[PDB]
Every structure is written in structure tokens, then in C-alpha cells.
Amino acid sequence: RSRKLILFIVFLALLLDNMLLTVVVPIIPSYLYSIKHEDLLNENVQVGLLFASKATVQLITNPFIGLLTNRIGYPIPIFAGFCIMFVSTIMFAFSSSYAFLLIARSLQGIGSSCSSVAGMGMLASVYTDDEERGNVMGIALGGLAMGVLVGPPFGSVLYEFVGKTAPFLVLAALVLLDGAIQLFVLQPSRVQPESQKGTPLTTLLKDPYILIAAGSICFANMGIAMLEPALPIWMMETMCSRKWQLGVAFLPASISYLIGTNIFGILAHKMGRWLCALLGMIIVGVSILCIPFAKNIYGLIAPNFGVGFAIGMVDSSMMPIMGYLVDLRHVSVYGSVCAIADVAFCMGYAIGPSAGGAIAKAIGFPWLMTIIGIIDILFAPLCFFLRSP
Ligand SMILES: COC(=O)[C@H]1[C@H]2C[C@@H]3c4[nH]c5cc(OC)ccc5c4CCN3C[C@H]2C[C@@H](OC(=O)c2cc(OC)c(OC)c(OC)c2)[C@@H]1OC
């Protein structure tokens, strides 16, 4: 009856959430191109809306699930989001209709948000010690980040080796194992009238100082959000990739993310968070500019590594400064940093792929990548105001 067990269930829950969020990336455009082979960019823009559907649904849903966890209890909605995730797995596996894909992703968003809120809530509640709670949240988020490293090569290899249905089924089997673990971990379900601070996050979002860092993360991951759906079609077109290099194309970004965060989480505190974020944004800009420069799959290993490393740079700079500013000049509560980070990520993935597809409909991929480079460069100086809050 170890608490580390519940840590394991929540860890694998959000890890599986990201893994399923990510393995869907290099396969759906293949579906759409294959179906349409037997309105050329309408499929691309509807892919962009498909990717943005989860972000929009989660953004709308998060207050509702927060209130629901406040009112009815902690154990019920995690299992509800579990069942939702299982339905999403089955719809990705067996269903092949585009509208079915939109419904599956939109449904998936609710369960993903519900897990990402309520599991963190239990992880904080059971872990009474504040420092212990903080470091366990850190390791849970580290697994959350490592899930998107696991995802893409797994999905691409199982897409090419077996077919269109095998890897979603493997993810579904992982879902069932997770649910068995969750059910066996906790036999009873309690109402859990946990007490929480009444100060909301709308005041935190209203502050420009937090908003600058939130926007920094927003565009920093809007780069990768816009990078997600365009690359597969960009490799089917004028690139003649052999239908499997998608996973090995996205892998360097993830591995660079993990190595950069792991090697700068101890250094950004020493050297300075504001200039660290400044350099991170500059590196995002230059790598994003250089992604069009590559003309072969071998070439893309460098700029993807750069953008992943720089996104890790920005995250390592900006994750602790949220809590620092919140403790300095706002309500001293835990979990609001996670809430503001989540709303920033949802914002970015809401307008990332949608605007990416909208631009790609009439403007080519090179100008898209360059222009988001200009937004990155232009946003870089605004981080200087964060040096002395
Ligand atoms: C898409 O999936 C995501 O959206 C997550 C990742 C996004 C993003 C990403 N996508 C990729 C897709 C690729 O091929 C398609 C290749 C590389 C990447 C990378 C590298 C960079 N990155 C990692 C991922 C980062 C995740 O978020 C957090 O790890 C996080 C961390 C925190 O502290 C560290 C938080 O605060 C305590 C927090 O609040 C909830 C969230 C993020 O949200 C869940």
C-alpha cells in the first residue's frame, strides 16, 4: 500500500497521455493522403484543426474538471478520464473516418486534462511534506516529458512494420494495464473534501509579469506545435521519405529536450533565468529559421536538435520563475504554477497547428518557418524586463 505506487499510476497515466498524443502525429497525414489519393490542402487544414481540437477542448474543460474535483471527489474523475482515454484508444485503433478522428481527439482532450489535474491533486495531497511534494511533482513531470521521447519512433516503427492498427492496440493494452494497476492500488473511493486556497489563477493571469513568461513558453512550444503537422506532408512532398523516417525525424528534438533540461536545471539558477530564456528564444529562432535550409533527412537532424534543445532551454528557464514570481508577489499556493503552465501550453497548441495550417494553405512552408522565426526573435527582447521584477 505504498504511496509510491500511486505515484507510479499517475506517472504512467500522464506518460501514456503524452505518448498517445504524440504517436498520432506521424500517422494521420498518411491516412488522409492515402484516402485522398484514391481540395488538396483542405485535408492539411483539417489536420491542423484536428491537432488543435484537443488543445481547445482541454482549455475549455479545465475549469469544469477543477470544479468537479473540488465538489464530487478525487478518485472518480481519474477513472472517468481513464475510460475516456480507453475510448480514444479504440477510436484511433479501429475507426478510420476523419470525423471519427476529430471526435476521438476532442474526447481525448477531456480525459487528458482530467488526469493532468486530478492526478497531480492526489500526488500533492498524499505527499504531506512540501519539499517531497515538489520533487515528486518534478519527477512526474519528468516522466511526462519522457513520454514524448518514447512516442514517435515507437509509433512510426509499428506503423511501418505491421500496419495502421497495431500500435494503437499496443497503447490500448498499456491503458488496460494502467487501469488494472489503478484499480488494485486503491480499493475504496472517498469524497475527499480537501481544503484549498480561495485565491484564483485569473489574478495571476491578469498580471503582465507572469504573462510575459507564459507567452514565452507559448511561442516557444508554438514552434514545435506548428512543426508537428507540417513535417510529414513536407516529407511526402518533394522529399520522398520512405514513410517511416517520421519517428527518427522527431526523435532528436525529444532527446535534445531531455538532455538540455537535465543539464541546465542546475545551471540556469546559477547563471540567470532571464538571460537564459533570452538565449533559449534566440536559439529557437535560429533553429526554426534553419529547418527549411535542410534538403535531406540527414540534414534535419541538426535543426530539430537545436529547436528541441532550445525549447528545453526556455522551459528550464521559465518553469521555476513562475513559482518565484507567484511566491514573491501573489498568493503562496502550490499547483497554480502547474495551472498557468498548462493554460499556456493549451493556448499555444490551440493556435499553433491551426494557424500553421492556415498559413500553409496559401503560404509555403519556408515562409511559415521563417516568419515564426521572426516572432521568436521579436519576443526575445521582452524577456529582458523579467530580469528585475
Ligand atoms: C506535445 O506534447 C506536449 O505538449 C509536451 C512536450 C512539448 C513539448 C514537445 N512536443 C514534441 C513533439 C515532438 O514530435 C512530435 C517532438 C518533440 C516535442 C516536444 C519537446 C518539448 N515539449 C515537452 C514536452 C513538454 C510537455 O510539458 C511539460 O513537460 C511540462 C513541464 C513542466 O515542468 C517541466 C510543467 O510544469 C510543472 C508542465 O506543466 C504541465 C508541463 C508538453 O505538454 C504536455
Numbering used by the authors: 17 to 54, 123 to 473
From the paper:
Here we present cryo-EM structures of human apo VMAT2 in addition to states bound to serotonin, tetrabenazine, and reserpine. These structures collectively capture three states, namely the lumen-facing, occluded, and cytosol-facing conformations.
To capture the cytosol-facing state which was previously proposed to favor RES binding, we used the Y422C mutation (VMAT2YC) which was presumed to weaken the cytosolic gate. We then incubated VMAT2YC with 1 mM RES and determined a 3.7 Å structure (VMAT2YCR) at a cytosol-facing state. An elongated density of ~20 Å was observed in the translocation funnel of VMAT2YCR map. This density matches the shape of the multi-ring RES. On the opposite side, the indole group is also perpendicular to the middle rings and is inserted snugly in the central cavity of VMAT2 transport passage. This indole group assumes a similar position of 5-HT, explaining its competitive nature. The tertiary amine on the middle tandem rings established hydrogen bond and salt bridge with Asn305 and Asp399, respectively, as well as a cation–π interaction with Tyr341. At the cytosolic vestibule, the trimethyoxylbenzoyl group brings in the cytosolic halves of the N- and C-domain by engaging with Leu225, Leu228, Met403, Ala425 and Phe429.
